[PDB]
Write a protein that binds this ligand. Structure first.
Ligand SMILES: O=P(O)(O)Oc1cccc2c1NCCC2
Length: 105
């Protein structure tokens, strides 16, 4: 159950996810997973980033779920579960702003 994962924040808004992540103590890749505000059946992975251009900022990626039972951000790289998707992105940045590092405090 995705609801038992400490990185799953359930039904919080995008603005609230930004408030939690825009903390100067958060290193790049600090993240959380929440329900999408407008897309029924999709989740959003919210991730903190940092560069000298923008400083501290937050990106949101849509995690799609297939009825066949697969989870993915890009259809070319799918996973059997949200847990496996999170594990994969903690090691590969691929197209994300940064690899996932720490669960949002
Ligand atoms: O849940 P939100 O606020 O991040 O709003 C969205 C609704 C649906 C999809 C997405 C949202 N924000 C941009 C990225 C994808």
């Amino acid at each position: 159950s995705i609801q038992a994962e400490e990185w799953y924040f359930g039904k919080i808004t995008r603005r609230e996810s930004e408030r939690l992540l825009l903390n100067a103590e958060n290193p790049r890749g600090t993240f959380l997973v929440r329900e999408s505000e407008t897309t029924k059946g999709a989740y959003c992975l919210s991730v903190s980033d940092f560069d000298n251009a923008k400083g501290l900022n937050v990106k949101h990626y849509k995690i799609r779920k297939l009825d066949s039972g697969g989870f993915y951000i890009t259809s070319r790289t799918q996973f059997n579960s949200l847990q496996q998707l999170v594990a994969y992105y903690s090691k590969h940045a691929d197209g994300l702003c940064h690899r996932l590092t720490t669960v949002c405090p």
